[PDB]
Design a protein around this ligand. Structure first.
Ligand code: HEM
Ligand code: HEM
Ligand SMILES: CC(C)(C)OC(=O)N[C@@H](CS[C@@H](Cc1ccccc1)C(=O)NCCc1cccnc1)Cc1cccc2ccccc12
Ligand SMILES: CC(C)(C)OC(=O)N[C@@H](CS[C@@H](Cc1ccccc1)C(=O)NCCc1cccnc1)Cc1cccc2ccccc12
Lengths: 443, 443
């Protein structure tokens, strides 16, 4: 089974038996994807155990898989287990059950619904300043992820449910999902062990965080919100499926929002001029520290360039994947049934044949003077096509709203302990080795 | 393999294939052991999957297995996995590695060392009264296990290490070891799945409590104690084996001490006369609320009768087991290699052919006028022989010391919510269904 890509004439590193090519993951997913993108070219294949992976970098081929041939062939992501009752979570769900859930939740983030959330997000923007002013009046390096995470948690809890929480350090036991070496190295490389753990109620999500969130949502039936949108569409949605969806939203609303914001601040400190240009624009659109509104956030263009260049340098995706569910021949390339087509997003976001000086932080790539020279199937921080990020527009809102309220009040300088250059987590997920600490100064 | 006991002419319930007799565990271990002890007699056999179990109730046969033929045949308990690095814990350890550890820790609880711990245990006895006086001056039903557990934790931490903690509710993340239905039903009945989970770092003890206790012991190398006894015998003991032993002591020092004390209080409230007779003796040996000392505790005889009758009614053991490691013929009964000889302690502690009115709490069984009519191989709350409870003498001390300090100061009456009669946990471990709540009144 380790000779499929040799058959199709698709290059790739030689796999060791059983292990495939996982030993190349010692420098992490991303360093391996960049190496092969240089070593082999536009299309190559490797193995995660006995699961062949077809990496494609052709924008047409990427558009065909993400957008064109989505509903017919490339509908599902690579399977993820054991998960227990989280099998109904939309992002894991497959085929018709996913389509049923995706439409069931698409009206959550309409521009009408997102506008309604601006007065709610406006409250916790001030709690963020106050919690910052404390660690600013005392010259004490601030761990941004702790205070950003404290902010994103309060926002996602109210925008989708109705519960608040003010720093009583729903308590954000969102402390699981620790990706790394075993026991994930075993499952991806030895896959039929997943049905074993499933029948044992063994779950990659710990029992503590689940039963804690399993009950907490029950207190959320106080007698239009996301949860208010689910019972109105239940009145056939299970009582347990509703919780699985909730857990998806709370996690992504906390981790990803606080992570990208932290990455964003590290970039603004390491480039003081960029932070000046961005602060000068926020005072131009919202003077006297004017309250940021839905229409002002979409107006700020440099803010959007700072968000996207950060997302370019730190794609919290790294890869996009779809399982090819039947034989096809996309763009003159036959692809057998079962292969996992993979888009190496991280490598694509640094390919010198698309970006000038790819490693340097330069918001000016995404200027309207230059954003024409940017292929939207090379740069897809929120994915693309029917199965792209369902929270994209809301997340770009929540991040931009907070970036405004903070930059109106403080500035950010590096510390002695600030890791420069920042080493990415050579592990699995896209994080830093050492956390991000920056000095905060009040204006 | 389900026909061994049919071969040996040893009666027992018919096993279903694969499952054996585990379906009889619906009423818990103990109800099943009492039924068979009546249904079949002095010796019977069943199956926990494909592991046959020989239950023996003959005192001679019990003495032979626990005491006589211990070192040669019945050395090890039934195997317990997956456990990870806890394989070196003395209570799991086997053959020569256990003997090495058992001698290495036997001098921990000498009468010289136990006497040294009385002035230490005397401190937290007063914190127990104060924490009781709060919930006593406010007529609020008290959960005994919470406050007893808060006490036993402070005692075991200092008597073996040197760290204290005063109710800041080592924080006693001793909240794992949840025995019950799956995934334990799978392992005991389907056993070769244990080596699977072992190679995945999967562990019946959660990673949170381990890494929390794995590090906390490192802070315990401040530059004669249990820990002080281990490095002096290390100067070949591993750095990791030392932690595994510690985890054994902290758990048993917290859970079992607080559990038996809770059971003891429920019995004293449901029998007001017994509590009067016990309080009258404590005032006779320690008047003016005299501080309890090593020699006064061993002097109190009714205190000892209240502890043992409670332990008779609630054997935190329920069963004792040893793996028969080679073919033998004990007491005219051949026993093949591999069988798990089992002593059904709970059933034996209520056999009407040894105790008069076995279900009624009656301290007067264990009076020196009657303690001759009590077979020490029927009543073994601390086991027996070389592998009996290594903490027995210290636990009987710690419990009796606390029972004195509390009964000197308060009395205990039932509540409206106090479960009467107390339903045992129909689950696995020996606990109650509903927790024990009792009214506290100051004298
Ligand atoms: C900077 C923030 C975020 C980024 C960069 C991001 C990116 C992504 C990406 C790349 C995907 C996979 C898309 C694909 O396979 O084509 C995805 C999926 C998803 N995201 Fe996000 N996301 C972000 C924030 C959020 C937020 C705030 C939510 C709130 C609910 C959210 C909910 C989801 C869901 C439910 C999916 C599942 C998509 C499906 O299979 O239908 N994301 N996201
Ligand atoms: C009421 C309190 C306790 C009771 C009823 C009790 C009872 C028992 C029993 C029945 C056994 C198995 C004996 C056998 O198989 O023959 C045992 C083993 C053990 N107990 Fe306890 N115990 C108590 C408290 C403690 C305490 C406070 C410690 C403190 C360290 C402790 C440490 C141990 C250890 C290390 C073993 C392992 C024996 C071995 O395999 O060498 N126990 N206990
Ligand atoms: C990537 C790796 C190897 C670390 O593995 C996974 O992250 N794979 C998840 C399933 S694909 C994930 C989308 C995604 C793909 C690639 C990169 C980043 C995200 C997705 O849709 N995530 C749902 C919410 C979310 C998270 C982050 C950003 N946007 C949205 C498995 C997973 C992760 C975390 C929480 C989960 C909760 C319930 C069910 C599955 C969960
Ligand atoms: C009994 C059942 C099915 C619930 O299973 C186990 O309890 N079987 C344990 C291994 S035999 C246990 C002795 C024992 C036998 C029978 C009944 C009660 C106790 C033993 O020696 N326990 C060590 C400390 C202790 C506990 C209680 C009382 N006295 C001492 C497995 C086990 C349990 C708890 C913590 C552990 C920590 C490290 C390694 C193993 C551990």
């Amino acid at each position: 089974s380790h000779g499929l890509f040799k058959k199709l004439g698709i290059p790739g590193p030689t796999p060791l038996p059983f292990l495939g090519n996982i030993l190349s993951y010692h420098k992490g997913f991303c360093m391996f994807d960049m190496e092969c993108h240089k070593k082999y070219g536009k299309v190559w294949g490797f193995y995660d155990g006995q699961q062949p992976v077809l990496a494609i970098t052709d924008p047409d081929m990427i558009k065909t898989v993400l957008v064109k041939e989505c509903y017919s062939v490339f509908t599902n992501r690579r399977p993820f287990g054991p998960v227990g009752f989280m099998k109904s979570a939309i992002s894991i769900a497959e085929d018709e059950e996913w389509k049923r859930l995706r439409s069931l939740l698409s009206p959550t983030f309409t521009s009408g619904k997102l506008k309604e959330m601006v007065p709610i997000i406006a409250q916790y923007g001030d709690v963020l300043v106050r919690n910052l002013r404390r660690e600013a009046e005392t010259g004490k390096p601030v761990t941004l992820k702790d205070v950003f995470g404290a902010y994103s948690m309060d926002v996602i809890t109210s925008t989708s449910f109705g519960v608040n929480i003010d720093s009583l350090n729903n308590t954000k036991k969102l402390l699981r999902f620790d990706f790394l070496d075993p026991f994930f190295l075993s499952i991806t490389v030895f896959p039929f062990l997943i049905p074993i753990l499933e029948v044992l109620n063994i779950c990659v999500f710990p029992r503590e965080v689940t039963n804690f969130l399993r009950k907490s949502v029950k207190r959320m039936k106080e007698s239009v919100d996301f949860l208010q949108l689910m019972i109105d569409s239940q009145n056939a949605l299970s009582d347990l499926e509703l919780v699985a969806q909730s857990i998806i939203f709370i996690f992504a609303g906390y981790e990803t929002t606080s992570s990208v914001l932290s990455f964003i601040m590290y970039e603004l400190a390491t480039h003081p001029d960029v932070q000046q240009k961005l602060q000068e624009e926020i005072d131009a659109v919202l003077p006297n520290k004017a309250p940021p509104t839905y229409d002002t956030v979409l107006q700020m263009e440099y803010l959007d360039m700072v968000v996207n260049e950060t997302l370019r340098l730190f794609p919290i995706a790294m890869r996009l994947e779809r399982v090819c569910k039947k034989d096809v021949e996309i763009n003159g390339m036959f692809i057998p049934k079962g292969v996992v087509v993979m888009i190496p997003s991280y490598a694509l976001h640094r390919d010198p044949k698309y970006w000038t000086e790819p490693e340097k932080f330069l918001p000016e790539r995404f200027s309207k003077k230059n954003k024409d020279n940017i292929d939207p199937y090379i740069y897809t921080p929120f994915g693309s096509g029917p199965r792209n990020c369902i929270g994209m527009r809301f997340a770009l809102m929540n991040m931009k709203l907070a970036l405004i309220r903070v930059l109106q009040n403080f500035s950010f300088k590096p510390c002695k302990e600030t890791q420069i250059p920042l080493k990415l987590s050579l592990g699995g997920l896209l994080q830093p080795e050492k956390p991000v600490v920056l000095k905060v100064e009040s204006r």
